[PDB]
Write a protein that binds this DNA or RNA. Sequence first.
RNA 1: ACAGGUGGUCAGGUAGAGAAUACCAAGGCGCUUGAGAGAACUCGGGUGAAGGAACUAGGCAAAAUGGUGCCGUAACUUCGG
RNA 2: UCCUUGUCGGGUAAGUUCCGACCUGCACGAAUGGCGUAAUGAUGGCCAGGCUGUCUCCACCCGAGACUCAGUGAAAUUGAAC
RNA 3: GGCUCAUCACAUCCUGGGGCUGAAGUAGGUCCCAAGGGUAUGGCUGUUCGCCAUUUAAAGUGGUACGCGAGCUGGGUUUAG
RNA 4: AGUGGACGCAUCACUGGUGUUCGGGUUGUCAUGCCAAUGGCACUGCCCGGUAGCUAAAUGCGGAAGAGAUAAGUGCUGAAA
Lengths: 120, 209, 98, 102, 56, 113, 122
Amino acid sequence: MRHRKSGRQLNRNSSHRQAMFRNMAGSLVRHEIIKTTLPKAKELRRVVEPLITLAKTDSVANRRLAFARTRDNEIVAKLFNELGPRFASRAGGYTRILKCGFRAGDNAPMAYIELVDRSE
Amino acid sequence: MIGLVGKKVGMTRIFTEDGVSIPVTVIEVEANRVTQVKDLANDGYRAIQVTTGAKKANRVTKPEAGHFAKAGVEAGRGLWEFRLAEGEEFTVGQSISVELFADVKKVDVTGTSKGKGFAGTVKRWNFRTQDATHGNSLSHRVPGSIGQNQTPGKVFKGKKMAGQMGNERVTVQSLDVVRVDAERNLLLVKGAVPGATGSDLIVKPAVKA
Amino acid sequence: DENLNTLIDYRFEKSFRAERGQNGASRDCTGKRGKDVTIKVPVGTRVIDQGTGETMGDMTKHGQRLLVAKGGWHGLGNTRFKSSVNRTPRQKTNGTPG
Amino acid sequence: QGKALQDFVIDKIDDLKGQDIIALDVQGKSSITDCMIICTGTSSRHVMSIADHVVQESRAAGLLPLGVEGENSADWIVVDLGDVIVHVMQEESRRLYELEKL
Amino acid sequence: AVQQNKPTRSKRGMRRSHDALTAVTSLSVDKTSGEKHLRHHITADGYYRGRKVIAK
Amino acid sequence: NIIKQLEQEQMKQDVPSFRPGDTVEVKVWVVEGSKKRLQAFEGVVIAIRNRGLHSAFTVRKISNGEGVERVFQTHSPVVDSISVKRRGAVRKAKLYYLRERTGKAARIKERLN
Amino acid sequence: MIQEQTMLNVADNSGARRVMCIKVLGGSHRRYAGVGDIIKITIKEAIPRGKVKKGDVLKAVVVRTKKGVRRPDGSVIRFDGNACVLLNNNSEQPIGTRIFGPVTRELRSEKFMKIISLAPEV
RNA sequence: ACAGGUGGUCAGGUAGAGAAUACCAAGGCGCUUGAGAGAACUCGGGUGAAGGAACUAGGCAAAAUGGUGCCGUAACUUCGG
RNA sequence: UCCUUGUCGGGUAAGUUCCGACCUGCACGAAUGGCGUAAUGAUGGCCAGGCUGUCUCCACCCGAGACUCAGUGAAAUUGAAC
RNA sequence: GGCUCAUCACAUCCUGGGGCUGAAGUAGGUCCCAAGGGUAUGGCUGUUCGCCAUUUAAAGUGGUACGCGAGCUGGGUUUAG
RNA sequence: AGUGGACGCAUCACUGGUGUUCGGGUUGUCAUGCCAAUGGCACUGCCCGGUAGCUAAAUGCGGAAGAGAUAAGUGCUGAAA
């Protein structure tokens, strides 16, 4: 009964949730900012933020593991090259949540989840 | 006699020389500072009001802060009281330590058990489950009948049916003690106590034989 | 019986009644067999009847159970007389006498 | 208390008509029994009489026996004194079981 | 199951007593630009905490 | 936190570390009357659960044509001497598949190191 | 963890090989059998030249349990194949002259140490 | 703007005995309401210690075997099985 | 047609169902066909072996509803109801 | 009729307190008070009931329109073949 | 005094179950250009385990003792008489 449990459901199966966070994390790092629902952004921090942590140290073994996630060569190429050096001095807190009210189609709480640096 | 208020920490076991494994629950009991004493003259019953723990002064409200300042004692996480045993006396501002449990050998433990939400009837009173086959349709764990045909015309009060578990006071009687930790402020009791980790508990000497 | 050593209760009670078999009921119900009454007797008893009667059996050791009276045996309801030509059985068989 | 209790029972059971006694060393073979001593009785009454005697004296001997086996039957009865085990038997049923390599 | 009698405006009215909406009464003023917004929500012009948000 | 410091006092720091799938020799205490002696148990470990003071491991052996398994506690006073006879070479943590096939056809090669 | 209508093995030379217990004892609504218990059995497979015959109903005592026992120090003794020893119906003396397979020490507390005297393994 | 019915032609690759099957080529779609925690309960399922039909009218449902080559294959028979 | 389900055997520890038989049984009944019949049958009944949440005793988990929010928006029934 | 769910009265099955006894003790038999709790598992048949097998303290008697299908079951009864 | 069955409560420390969010093995296929390494699908593709949480089969506790008025019954003193 959710006692001491983590990980939401999102009305999607386990495979769909993995694909959900795979595409969303790649979208955030590529465009440096994405707009998504409030719980999805919160749960994305459990996926996108650890990616930079593996990208803090550049190595072939870490890059291959980082390639296994986000299933994209462009995304991993950006990591270990530009996110690494900029986030090297920061331990955690790689992204912040900026809520922007509700949608006009279904009354869904949106939030601007973006990287804290945001290119200065 | 009086009891103490502690915090549940976890469950472990104690290994003995003769080879007896006894499960033990770790209870963190701190210095219990009494806040005010009631007597027969004031309200008609003997009770000593005690608090434990520490609370940040930011959200300690003025009525709570003023009450604590009246006794000269610091803030506490929660406030409780205990009944006297007709012949012992205590003074306001005195801190109650843990060594009094070194001779009881039996302690009653009370607290709020884990909340299990709106549980089913098959879970709340171990209702027997109907057959999941042999034509059974849309009824596998439902209670089924709840009354009699037109003679009572209603369902009796106190019927055992689907409800909500937990978030209620639960008492376990005559829980054996293992050791009393005074220099570290721990209470060791054999068995399992109600409630989860971090939940406040009330421990009193056992009233039964 | 070991504990009993006389027939004192037998002067007290000269009649022993076994449980009569329950009558048949509706819904094809069969009555329960009457409970067998067991009589506690001191060891070494001999029992004699009338009408050129003789002994039934000598008791030498405890634990021997002797069959003295056979109860009557149950009758038959109308259902057992099921048939096509009759098609309405009003006949029943009386129980055998004890 | 190994040989002390062993000598404490063999002499006293002999005083109560203890016939055909065998002293067996089982050390290294079983981890539950230390010494197997065998006693024989004439019939049911004899084996029961010695069985009650050995447990009656054990109560006054300090050590408490850990159990008995003979109930409403004298075919096999065996009682314990802790480290040492004593088997009191009769002639007929002994040969039915196996002897002296238990 | 179906009803056996017709409920009235009185029966309908009390059941709707808890259907009334609640005013937010939680409008905040930005310390830099000065537009009304909700707690912890960026303004319609893209302003929050007085720091220059994307403002798109 | 305060619970964590309790185990270290009750822990013993003399238990050797062994791989799952090794032949282990254990001398287990037994209580009877007033004599408290050792009992020898020969077998191969098929599971390791090293969690706190209650770290456990399962020892399985075959006696008289049937398989018998026993669980233990590393930090319990019941066990006194624990030794490793043959170091097995299996690349799996839990060895629960030994129950299916016979032991005579399920010999484990040495680690060779 | 032996219940009503449970198929068990036989751990003595009485003559039975495959057995099926039919009635567990101990009280009303007796659910399951532990390690030292009196359980009633029915013989399903036995050697025709043995001491017993197929179809006989009598009492027996379990010696090995698939679920295992509970040592008072957080230990269990599991087994592969539940087994029983033949005992008479009127008297609680066992029938088999020899016992096959180990027997746990927990049978001492249940007061059937005679079985423990046999079965030299453990 | 219905989870139904409607005849013909074209018949790609991979393993396969194949027009079954799993992925996939060209091609077409995500099924005109969605966002939230995953309560009882309902539906489709997955797993399970000990026992294995003891539930039930009934092995109902479930669970289980399932392919190729080789050896062997009973009673009976119309000599085909 | 009945008595002690007819009672002996298999099947089961225990079998109002099943299988050849004892008898106190003969009505049907020989193209409104009788007897036996290999193979065949989503055919009636019974038993056995493996198998399992069918069950003792249910527990957990994966999804769609059930719940809240936003949008659209029925139903059978109703003499009146505090 | 079975499953889930129970409730009430005591003309009490056990446990509890007694009287009498032709009650030496255990074991018994009858009667009185007492409803707080408990009051079975399987084969047969659709079964209620009953027989049998095996336990315990027993496997209680009746009302509940011989309780309970806007809870389940369709095995009997069961229109149409 | 000890130990048992059912019942209820509490916890996951032990022993297990689940644990499609953790790791690994493996079959077919597609893709990342390719070797290697990965990801998608095939019930979680099929299995081996397994973190917390939940849970029982797992482990602790309880049915009180006692106080007042009592039923049946047993009584003390004592008149109507």
